[PDB]
Design a protein around this nucleic acid. Structure first.
Lengths: 129, 87
RNA sequence: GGGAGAAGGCACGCUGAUAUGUAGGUGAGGUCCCUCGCGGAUGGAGCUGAAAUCAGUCGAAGAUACCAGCUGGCUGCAACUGUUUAUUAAAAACACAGCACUGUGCAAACACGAAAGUGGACGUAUACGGUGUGACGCCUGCCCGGUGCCGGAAGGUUAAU
RNA sequence: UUAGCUAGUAGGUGGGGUAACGGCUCACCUAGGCGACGAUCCCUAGCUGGUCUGAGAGGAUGACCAGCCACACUGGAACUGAGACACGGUCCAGACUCCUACGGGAGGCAGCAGUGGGGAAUAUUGCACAAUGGGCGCAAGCCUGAUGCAGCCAUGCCGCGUGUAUGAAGAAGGCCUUCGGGUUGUAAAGUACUUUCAGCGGGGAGGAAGGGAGUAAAGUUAAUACCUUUGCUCAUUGACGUUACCCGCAGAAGAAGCACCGGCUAACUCCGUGCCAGCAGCCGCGGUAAUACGGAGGGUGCAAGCGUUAAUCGGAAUUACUGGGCGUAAAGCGCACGCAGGCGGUUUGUUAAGUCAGAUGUGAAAUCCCCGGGCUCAACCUGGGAACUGCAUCUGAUACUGGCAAGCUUGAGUCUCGUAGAGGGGGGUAGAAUUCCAGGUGUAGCGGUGAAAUGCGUAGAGAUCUGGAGGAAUACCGGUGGCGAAGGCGGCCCCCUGGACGAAGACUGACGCUCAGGUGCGAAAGCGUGGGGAGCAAACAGGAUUAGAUACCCUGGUAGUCCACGCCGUAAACGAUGUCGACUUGGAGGUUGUGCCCUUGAGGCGUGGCUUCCGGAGCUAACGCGUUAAGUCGACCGCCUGGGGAGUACGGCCGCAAGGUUAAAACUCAAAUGAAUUGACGGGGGCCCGCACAAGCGGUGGAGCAUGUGGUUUAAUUCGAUGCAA
RNA sequence: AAUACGUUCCCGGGCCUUGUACACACCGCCCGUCACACCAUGGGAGUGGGUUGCAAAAGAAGUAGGUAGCUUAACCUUCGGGAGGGCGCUUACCACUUUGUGAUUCAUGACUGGGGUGAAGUCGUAACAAGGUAACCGUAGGGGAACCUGCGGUUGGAUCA
RNA sequence: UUCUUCUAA
């Protein structure tokens, strides 16, 4: 049943944009926060609110612009059936670099343009555009 | 199309064959005339197509269209074929 | 299950070694127990003794004599083991397990018997008698006009009376 | 449609053997070894750098150059030697050829030429060791069919010509024409100019540098012998060679051709031709006016070549890793189970495997790329660089994925009370119906069809009542209800038994998902033994029916339908939608729980499970789906790849068989196909009209003649019209 | 003059509607035996090749081992011999070659099975509309041919005081 | 109740 919480997360983001919701909540993970603390920093969400003691629940705030949405695309690169590990030179450019690609390297979670300036590759999670 | 199925079984690209097998990947092959005759074609056209039954080099017995208008062909004659179907 | 000993091929004597008797079999005198016996263990002398290997060695040939399968391929018929023309015919004939029909409620049907009675059967319809067919596999069509059989009782016919 | 393979096999011990280790070999032990990550077997094949295509991913490919390997008439074996199982060595067997006095011998072009052969097709018994090397020698040298040259083929890649200006009378002529003209066409003619190349004639580098001799000095030694080293002279060394390059010479001279014009795709007329001749990559042209045939003119495309065929990728995303789909266009197994398999909640450490980073090694050269250089450029040659996408090693890195431990409880699973149910087997039991049997009553028909008839009846049917027997199914309830994974399950009762849901809880600690191979279930018909057999009903029989009726209809009627136990394993087994998650507008229901509110009545507010219709976004080729997705995403499995052939052949598998199952190929076509639109049509449905029918009256068709047509006849019976509409 | 109740049917036309594989348009499309012709193929008594397994036979050359025999320039030496070598002998291995039996593959094969294809035949008209007995899946039976029929399922079927 | 067929441009 539960084969990924990450692909659960991005689709809950994806279906919440079209549903025009302001708050998408889900149970939280350590890796989930490490991604959610990028897109606020990268300016694709407005707020995330990690709460919950017995079980942490991540509650998001969707960023909307001029009525319509901000997240024009949200994907998954390394699926659980097929993992993706690209070096620092094979880091992509989402929408010719205008979008961002979330990569997890040994130095935590960052974006690809930071990882190029970090000069070290790793596991590409998803594409956000 | 699941990659595990793609792992357990590769994509079988379909293998195509020649429509002109008697030349056996040659440009032209020598032949011997066996019977020279005419043949009515199929429904949309009506003619007497001059044509010859040919014994080849490799023992194959094929038919091959006589192009042009008029010829001097006999049986037991040495000819040369290039290919091409007649529709 | 078989076919199949299919077919086909190899070894085979003797001498020595292994091991001057081996594998094995038998099994004392000993020894201990013993309810002590027409005992039990242990114990192994003794005798008996395969099979194999190795190395020699003889002939033309070593399952040397006697003894003791000719094999193969296709097809007919019958499935088979059987039975038979004593005394010119052993089979394709018969029988057969099997199948089908039919009869029969027991004092059975039926058979032998003038009869009594007996077999049936000290069996009771998963029983018994008869006929046809003859394993097994796949099957088994049509015709009741005829001939039989079965069922019917309206009418015609009709005995002794 | 190759699943089992192996006995020196696999391992050990010991001995032997080889340069070396090791069943390398042998002996003796052990029974191992291998395989679904494809062993085994079969088919094909020298391998790589590379080459070709492709944007890449890839695909194909291995001539030429390289690196390796293998082979040398065939089959064998050793020998020798550091190195051989030796192309140009031996020895044996074979084959073939040759010599012989017949006793015997000899022979190996896959070296370079060449000959024959085969073939669609691939060159000279060419020259020369000058250079470059290689072998021997102190050297000189000797040899080299290695090597450097020439011939040969538009075999390929390049570079170059076959002139340049001018020239309208728009010449002639051709073609075409609206006969006016147009076009060929500045094209040619003519004029002025140029002489590249080829040719001819003359001239004239580099590749020839080295080395070689004679000499000088130094070193070495007793040496000023020799020798060595370094200077100096004499000569050189060229096969190509009549070189590269340079001047003369002469004239526009000696030098352009294929393919194409219907669309696809750049470029049209005319004339011949008449489904003939033909054309043809595809669609398709020719059946008297052809831009598609043939010819001409004109034009387009290329060019010393131009076409066709072959052959490979691309286009082709048409196997979709990049980069596909499976509701109906091909495609989700009939479902369920489940191993291997792949996949995995959460949190903490650990590990550092994967992963990432760095560094070393290697990834030969060539090639390709980039920057240069050289040949008059170009092709070509060549310098440097990058690249060679890898692999090995070392140093890290710790987010994730693993590995290791510990936890947590949401996932998953128990415990507790209940709930609904055609959920399952087993055994009873009812009531109607039908059939049959028996009887009473009673009389002449019954039955069936569109009509009938076969049939059943006076031998008393049918009908009617009474009695009895038997099998099968269980009215009403009953429901776009219920349950089961489906296949499916329907009177009532009993016995055994399953699943689901809900409620409060308690617990467990990730215990999960999917699942090739495997296992089970699995409608109906069919099969096997037994049983049973009312009704019904293949086949079959009769009767109709019709042109025919092996059918539809009637009257019959058997397997079969029922039961017991087994086989088969297919169904439009359909929701034509595989399973388990998560998210995402609603409305109207059905069914089944369970809280609250006074149930203030059949009420309201909740909260679950399941299911039906509608429908938003979204998606969809459309149709539609639409919180039970054909929406958005996750995991894993099954499948698809033009149509026919064909789920067929041939093998295997399974079955008593029927068959099931696995699963092609040849050949053939350019379609097949899905939705949806417009018409048309329906022995489809509504609505309306018409001497359309019905209601009427008179006629035609009979008769004779008139008139017209057909036919026949004729020397000729001129021609045309010939359903309705001659 | 007669007569018209009426619109059930007939013929035609219009309109809405539905179905639909039709579209030179139901005088439409369409199917299968059969006859003829063409094309490849299955099967097939067999037949002829190729390849290979298997079991043995086979033993040239070669080498290795043994070696009665014959023999033997360097070395030992009493000069007699010593070892060794030669030659032959035999053994081991093995090529050529042979036997049988399989397997596999190609070719061929009287005859026979379908398949596909026809610009004109014969027979019927099953499907497309409610295609004039709705259609189709299974499975079974029948039948010149499409097909028919039985059981079960599907709608991917029309109809509705 | 019954009722079939329309070659090839």
């Amino acid at each position: 049943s539960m084969q990924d919480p990450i692909a659960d997360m991005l689709t809950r983001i994806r279906n919440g944009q079209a549903a025009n919701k302001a708050a998408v909540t889900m149970p939280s993970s350590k890796l989930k926060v490490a991604i959610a603390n990028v897109l606020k920093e990268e300016g694709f969400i407005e707020d995330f609110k990690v709460e919950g003691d017995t079980k942490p629940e991540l509650e998001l705030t969707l960023k909307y612009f001029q009525g319509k949405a901000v997240v024009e695309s949200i994907q998954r690169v390394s699926r659980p059936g097929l993992r993706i590990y690209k070096r620092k030179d094979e880091l992509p450019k989402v929408m010719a670099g205008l979008g961002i690609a979330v990569v997890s390297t040994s130095k935590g979670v960052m974006t690809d343009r930071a990882a190029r300036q970090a000069g070290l590759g790793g596991e590409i999670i998803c594409y956000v555009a | 199309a699941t990659v595990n199925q793609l792992v357990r079984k590769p994509r079988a690209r379909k293998v195509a064959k020649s429509n002109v097998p008697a030349l056996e990947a040659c440009p032209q092959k020598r032949g011997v005339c066996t019977r020279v005759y005419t043949t009515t074609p199929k429904k949309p056209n009506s003619a007497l197509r001059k044509v010859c039954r040919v014994r080849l080099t490799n023992g194959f017995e094929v038919t091959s269209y006589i192009g042009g208008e008029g010829h001097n062909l006999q049986e037991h004659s040495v000819i040369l074929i290039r290919g091409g179907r007649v529709k």
